[PDB]
Paper text:
The human NME1 (non-metastatic expressed, isoform H1) is the first identified metastasis suppressor protein that plays a role in the inhibition of one or more steps within the metastatic cascade. NME1 is also known as nucleoside diphosphate kinase A (NDPK-A and NM23-H1). NME1 is a moonlighting protein with multiple catalytic functions: (1) the NDPK activity, which involves the transfer of a γ-phosphoryl group from a nucleoside triphosphate (NTP) to a nucleoside diphosphate (NDP) through the transient phosphorylation of histidine 118 (H118). Human NME1 shares more than 85% sequence homology with NME2 (also known as NDPK-B and NM23-H2) and is reported to function as a hexamer.
Residue numbers in the entry:
A (entry chain C): 2 to 152
B (entry chain B): -4 to 152
C (entry chain A): 1 to 152
Write the structure that this text describes.
């Protein structure tokens, strides 16, 4: 419910093109609560486990190499239906189909340079959060606006 | 008729709810209507009485959320507004996004700024008939200001 | 290559009058499209009649030409993968009544006849429009510093 969490990663192209603050602002202004935030170079072992559902796809090795080629911003956000709603805010996975107003619709063009990843399901979010963050890196606090965001 | 000056003079009632005020979204919301080309006619900051809210939401008096909605709308100040323009009722609703924020698209006010249906930041008239009733209920005629936008000939044919 | 497709975008006199030039350009730059041509001009009625030749028999044609000649326009050429189709998506529906929030027309204008901008509808129309509005020498070629982060 209101405490659902999702994993969002800003990809190396999102960092290189100076979109970190823009992306974070979209989640903050929506009313989602920041739980975790890290900046790192993800190892190929970590990326292969993150993208384990894609291990049989032809683009898998290139996606892992690319995701390891620069730093990423790993994040955890909390809120009601944050997994599904986070995916709507990102826009379609393929930027060609993403609508203006979405992060990919506004800021990127091609699927291998799509700036961001968001968990596709509550099950995938729980696995991704556990893989990228130690439990002690996730911060719990109450937003001063909680009563104005949720009944 | 299409292209008539009178069609450009349609008005709608928009209220920024207590959560929109609390979360500092008043300026953001007003900027969206101004940049679109809609003309501001009325604007006031007020605490709406429960009697005014019960009449505003009279069609919902039998819904289970009615009492909570009236209490919530009375719990803080609201920004009441009247905007004018071609199809401003329907287009204002499109700009707000779906009533339930879960279904509102990015780019819309609710799509960008809020999450749950009971805390949806804003109300807009659902039809020209509801707009006429709502404008009359929230504003005295002397609070509605008429003027001509300097960009009128660049917004309308 | 497919990443070198080009489209023609014109900001109409109402877009210039209402101070939307920078906002429109920012939308194309932030998307990752490359600016190729940019010129500010009063389009002649002869140029506009050729640009809108397919509408010469429509009842609104004379008013459209007069309107497009009534003030300056910003003529532009942008480059990128599927920039024609994607540029149209970014502009929003031709009729602003049907354009969604988040698009240029959805955010900034209301009526057809004052719809702030034009974008090529097809690669064939883009080639014709670019040739009509720009001399080849006005089109600038350079490589974006972010090319490898926009395209694989
Ligand atoms: N050709 C490709 N090159 C690189 N990554 C790709 C390619 N096709 C798909 N993907 C990635 O493969 C993942 C799955 O995308 P799909 O389109 O197959 O499914 P999805 O729309 O349900 O996410 C996406 O990763 P992301 O969530 O980190 O964006 C997508 O970007
Ligand atoms: N659970 C709820 N709690 C509070 N208000 C609600 C709830 N469900 C619906 N409403 C409100 O009830 C009003 C009518 O919304 P509906 O979606 O029911 O519309 P409808 O009656 O045509 O279906 C909306 O008010 P607004 O225009 O000021 O936003 C909507 O927000
Ligand atoms: N009543 C009208 N007055 C002025 N221009 C019009 C009118 N109806 C259509 N047009 C213009 O006629 C052109 C063709 O619009 P259509 O709706 O017929 O087709 P489109 O949606 O497939 O592009 C558009 O020009 P633009 O690309 O420069 O915007 C459109 O604006």
């Amino acid at each position: 419910a209101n405490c659902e969490r999702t994993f969002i990663a800003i990809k190396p192209d999102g960092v290189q093109r100076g979109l970190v603050g823009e992306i974070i602002k979209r989640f903050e202004q929506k009313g989602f609560r920041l739980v975790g935030l890290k900046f790192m170079q993800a190892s190929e072992d970590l990326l292969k486990e993150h993208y384990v559902d894609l291990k049989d796809r032809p683009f898998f090795a290139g996606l892992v190499k690319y995701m390891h080629s620069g730093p990423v911003v790993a994040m955890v956000w909390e809120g009601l239906n944050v997994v599904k709603t986070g995916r709507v805010m990102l826009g379609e996975t393929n930027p060609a189909d993403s609508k203006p107003g979405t992060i990919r619709g506004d800021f990127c063009i091609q699927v291998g340079r799509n700036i961001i990843h968001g968990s596709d399901s509550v099950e995938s979010a729980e696995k991704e959060i556990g893989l990228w963050f130690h439990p002690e890196e996730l911060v719990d606090y109450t937003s001063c606006a909680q009563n104005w965001i949720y009944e």
